[PDB]
């Protein structure tokens, strides 16, 4: 959650907003501009990418905060987890906060900060040939300078396995290929240079 | 991306000037950083170091940047200058200078910063792993009776590797699996004890 209690001593400079069981916090796209300190209760951030598509991001506690400031790249979309307290920040609010008092600047930068790190220390290739390595060094069986791997794995599946975007999943296996380093034709995986893969890998 | 905040040029004067030939440490490994570093020129790799000693590249950071923290972090930066570089070093005391004289920048900052989050959020799962066993199962697996044995080393490290997976959950998750009953991974073999809920999980 990364909470930032401190704040609640705060929340009378804001705008609560209480919110039902399931109803949307953030829309996905109504223009959001300010940030939302969530003091009882429980969110869910999914990010809507700009196919259609949904998935995760990340949940809110109680004292988290959520919202932004700005306009800022992405099309979230928040379900209140269960009946849940909120309070809005304006920057207008917020600039109101912090001539009350200082400390809270740091506040909040520290809490922004700490979530670079999180994110930022989490943050593809070689995880294919790491998955290709394996498979050529356990399945192996020479056929020649080459070795083949009598089994289809399609580009969907190493994508899943390698929890890797397909737009590359192709890129890097047409390299592999162009490379004279390997085929995964249809049915088998054929490995033209091991040394190559193991040093790559 | 390196999110440059380009308004925090107008004030480096309440700021810190500290210069660095290029290949020098910007960030000495686990040195103390409570400054915002600003690069006012040049180009800096940032790398961290896992509890392990281990090491990969955690941004890059460009003319006009904000890298650096207030505070501490358990993340472990080792930043050296790639071509010579003109920092600037905002202390709080400092920022807090900056604040006082112009309140507007606490702003911009703070978008500044809590754009970044978006990104990497936005960039940013056991599934894989499953995933991997599941193809590596259905394509090797020889049915023992219920079981299906493949023969293959599988150290815990590249599958983490292979699935951009941390290796807490690598480990956390053979752990759950041996348990549950699905999968034991015992040295050079692979014995599923259970493929139907092996894909259902998948």
């Not at 356990?138 to 020479?142: A, C, D, V």
């Given at each position: 959650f990364f909470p930032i209690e401190k704040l609640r001593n705060y929340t009378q400079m804001g705008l609560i907003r209480d919110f039902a069981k399931g109803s949307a916090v953030i829309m996905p796209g109504e223009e959001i501009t300010s940030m939302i300190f969530l003091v009882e209760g429980k969110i869910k951030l999914d990010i809507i990418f700009e196919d259609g598509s949904e998935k995760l991001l990340y949940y809110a506690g109680g004292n988290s905060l959520i919202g932004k400031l700005y306009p800022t790249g992405n099309?979230?979309?928040a379900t209140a987890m269960e009946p849940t307290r909120t309070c809005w920040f304006s920057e207008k609010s917020l600039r109101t906060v912090f001539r009350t008092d200082e400390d809270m600047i740091f506040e909040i930068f520290k809490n922004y900060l700490t979530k670079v790190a999180y994110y930022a220390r989490q943050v593809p290739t070689i995880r294919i040939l790491r998955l290709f390595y394996e498979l050529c060094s356990?399945?192996?069986?020479?056929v020649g300078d080459t070795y083949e791997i009598t089994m289809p794995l399609s580009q969907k599946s190493i994508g899943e396995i390698?929890?890797?975007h397909h737009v590359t999943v192709s890129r890097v296996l047409a390299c592999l290929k162009r490379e004279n380093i390997l085929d995964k034709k249809k049915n088998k995986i054929i490995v033209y240079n091991l040394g190559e893969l193991k040093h790559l890998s």
């Open positions: 099309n979230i979309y356990s399945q192996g069986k020479r390698t929890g890797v």
